[PDB]
Design a binder for this molecule. Structure first.
Ligand SMILES: NC(=O)C1=CN([C@@H]2O[C@H](COP(=O)(O)OP(=O)(O)OC[C@H]3O[C@@H](n4cnc5c(N)ncnc54)[C@H](OP(=O)(O)O)[C@@H]3O)[C@@H](O)[C@H]2O)C=CC1
Ligand SMILES: NC(=O)C1=CN([C@@H]2O[C@H](COP(=O)(O)OP(=O)(O)OC[C@H]3O[C@@H](n4cnc5c(N)ncnc54)[C@H](OP(=O)(O)O)[C@@H]3O)[C@@H](O)[C@H]2O)C=CC1
Lengths: 68, 518, 135
């Protein structure tokens, strides 16, 4: 619980050609790319992007409490 | 400076993580000292007997509070991980601190030559007093890297065999250079590790083991390996190696002063908080601790059952989640259609996995038979503890457009439902302690086009007011606008839940909460 | 078993081990690989793991090693058997006893051997240099 922000990433690969290949147009005009998250292998893969070793650390809330 | 979620184990709401050790009477009246992963600052601690030692008759309960954490971590770091043997040489940073003192006590028992780092000269005098075996050449400065030259010169350039390190950044690198062949490094500080600071691997050409010592793992896992450390501490206590640290006692009402004294960093030894005094009797077999005043916050028994009408609604799911975090382990949620969206299914599955005995009912509280069936289901899960009526059906439009059917539809789940709930609860709910119905500021302040909604909401308040006057519980909360799920800005969910926590513990009948625009 | 194998020349063994271990890792790692492979091996470690390193290249070059592994209980070791020949004989007798106990129990088995006569030492060295030998 609470918001976690990225602090480290071990490796990011980008391949625009594979990215264009993987995109598939939906029944609407909008395009889409399927994304799979494997926590066991610590890999997020979507289109031509592949993130591994993402580390997130809890950032304390600003406690602005603008609502009183 | 430290996020509460960093502590291992899924603690909820980040509440009461303070405290790790205590010393007090057991349920049977035996003096005991313990070690809890969290929630040690309290007038009562729930613990497994594996994490409880015995306080020998020579000791006073005050002294016992200093032993557990520091001596357990020292033993685990040296004996279990560093496999210390007699005659070795150790560099123990921050001797004045508790862990440093315990490490010195363990090392001097085996006969090792001990190098220690102390920030000032008063701490040097103290350590020289406590441990006469230390010579004048065994003290370095912990506020600069000068200790490296000291260790290197006085060891003939060979180095040290063990290093119980707690310093950070440039100090850590300087510590490694003191290692000798086959030397072991015991990292207990958690700054560089959290920051992923690099460590050159060239030190490993010298046969070297770089241990990471984290005792927080035992409190939550690795139970089998704990008995080793427990046995070591018990053996030390019976043999006399374990000697309590000097304690600066602070009374219960002055805990902020204790925290400030610790923060200033001038303390030597351990700071302890005296929740209660020690009695001369060896086994008092006392009934209860002396009562004290504390801010009142809501909690629920594990064996009772709660009913959230309209629990699959936007606010109902958040209210249930709040209830689960406060100790509810059997819940009944009502909805005409049932689970029909992904978010609801996700929440119910997570709650069921957590062990909560969630149950979705189609019983309609509009009809008396349906209300009786709902309460019977709650009884099947267990005694009814609380009833929350969050059902709503909206039909907006000015009076010229309104019609009797729309009024009936809007009033049924809120007006009739509350009447039937009150009847069935007065009939067959003796253990009930909460009965909350959620209203809207439209009832009090008024808002055009919501005449029927206001009528329904105002009608719920009367039932609650009658219930309280006759001795039974009741509370209507007039909310404004709920944001995450007039002239009033929408109110966030966390603020709403905090306010609800306040409201439940007030003695009044109808309460309101809203956020003014600009 | 058939699932006990991976590829050493590629860094794809990390996914194999992590998948087949249920995502936990491995308790003991005996690594002798290069820089990128060495880094990949560390990420295979589990809580209370122990990285036994017997290579030299990364150690010799003083390559960096992230200290976030330590927050997971971990024990990085430097294993050089050459230390025994220079000192620590009393520590060596333990290894000697272990080896003898293995010999008499049956755990120790001789490895497959390719024999080159004394006059053909150069051929033996070339054959080993090629890298196709097993045993
Ligand atoms: N891995 C684990 O699970 C554990 C880790 N540790 C860590 O090792 C250390 C020993 O624990 P503990 O007994 O609680 O230590 P203490 O808090 O009792 O002592 C900390 C030491 O830091 C120095 N110091 C002086 N003034 C300050 C100040 N204002 N702020 C911070 N440090 C100051 C002193 O050494 P000096 O006299 O040289 O100035 C002092 O002895 C801690 O840093 C602790 O986090 C130990 C136990 C458990
Ligand atoms: N959130 C807000 O802005 C404010 C709301 N309130 C009150 O506070 C509570 C907040 O809930 P809210 O987020 O509005 O909920 P929703 O309006 O999103 O849904 C109401 C819940 O009750 C159920 N329900 C609807 N009709 C009936 C019925 N006839 N019998 C039984 N259950 C029914 C709904 O499921 P289903 O339709 O499938 O039955 C749903 O679970 C409600 O009591 C609301 O009236 C007042 C002030 C502020």
């Amino acid at each position: 619980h609470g918001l976690y922000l990225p602090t480290r990433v071990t490796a990011i690969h980008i391949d625009p050609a594979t990215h264009r290949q993987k995109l598939y147009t939906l029944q609407d005009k909008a395009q889409v790319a399927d994304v799979v998250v494997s926590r066991w292998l610590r890999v997020t893969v979507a289109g031509g992007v592949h993130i591994s070793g993402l580390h997130t650390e809890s950032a304390p809330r600003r406690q602005q409490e603008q609502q009183v | 400076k430290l996020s509460p979620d960093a502590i291992p184990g899924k603690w909820t709401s980040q509440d009461s993580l303070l405290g790790m050790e205590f010393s007090g009477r057991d349920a049977s009246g035996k003096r005991v000292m313990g070690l809890v992963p969290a929630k040690g600052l309290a007038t009562s601690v729930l613990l497994s007997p594996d994490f409880l030692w015995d306080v020998p008759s020579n000791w006073t309960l005050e002294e016992a509070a200093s032993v557990p954490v520091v001596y357990s971590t020292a033993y685990y770091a040296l004996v279990v991980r560093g496999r210390v043997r007699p005659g070795e040489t150790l560099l123990i940073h921050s001797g004045s601190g508790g862990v440093g003192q315990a490490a010195i006590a363990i090392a001097l028992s085996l006969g090792c030559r001990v190098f220690t780092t102390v920030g000032s000269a008063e701490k040097r005098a103290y350590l020289q007093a406590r441990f006469p075996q230390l010579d004048s050449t065994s003290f370095a400065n912990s506020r600069d890297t000068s200790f490296e030259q000291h260790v290197l010169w006085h060891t003939g350039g060979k180095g040290v065999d063990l290093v119980l390190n707690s310093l950070a950044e440039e100090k850590l690198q300087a510590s490694v250079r003191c290692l000798a062949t086959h030397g072991r490094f015991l990292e207990i500080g958690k700054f560089d590790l959290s920051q992923n600071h690099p460590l050159g691997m060239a030190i490993f050409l010298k046969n070297v083991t770089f241990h990471g010592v984290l005792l927080d793992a035992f409190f939550n896992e690795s139970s089998a390996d704990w008995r080793e450390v427990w046995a070591l501490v018990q053996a030390g206590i019976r043999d006399g190696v374990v000697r309590p640290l000097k304690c600066t006692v602070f009374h219960g009402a002055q805990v902020e002063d204790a925290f400030r004294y610790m923060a200033q960093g001038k303390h030597i030894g351990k700071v302890v908080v005296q929740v209660l005094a020690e009695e001369p009797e060896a086994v008092l077999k006392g009934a209860k601790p002396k009562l004290m005043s504390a801010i009142s916050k809501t909690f629920c028994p594990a064996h009772k059952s709660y009913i959230i009408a309209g629990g699959l609604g936007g606010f109902g799911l958040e209210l249930a989640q709040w209830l689960i975090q406060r100790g509810v382990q059997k819940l009944v949620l009502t909805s005409r259609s049932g689970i029909r969206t992904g978010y609801q299914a996700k929440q119910v599955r997570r709650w069921r996995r957590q062990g909560v005995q969630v149950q979705v009912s189609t019983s309609n509280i509009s009809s008396l038979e349906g209300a009786r069936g709902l309460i019977a289901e709650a009884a099947q899960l267990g005694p009814v503890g609380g009833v929350f009526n969050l059902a709503v059906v909206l039909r907006d439009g000015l009076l010229e457009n309104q019609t009797p059917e729309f009024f009936q539809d809007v009033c049924k789940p809120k007006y009739s439902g509350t009447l039937n709930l009150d009847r069935v609860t007065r009939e067959a709910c003796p253990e009930l302690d909460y009965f909350v119905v959620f209203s809207s500021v439209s009832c009090g302040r008024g808002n055009a086009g919501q005449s029927n909604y206001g009528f329904a909401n105002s009608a719920m308040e009367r039932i609650c007011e009658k219930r309280r006057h006759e001795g039974l519980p009741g509370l209507a909360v007039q909310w404004g606008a709920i944001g995450d799920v007039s002239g009033t800005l929408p109110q966030r969910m966390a603020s709403c839940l905090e306010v609800l926590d306040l409201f439940l513990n007030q003695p009044h009948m109808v309460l309101s909460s809203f956020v003014l625009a600009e």
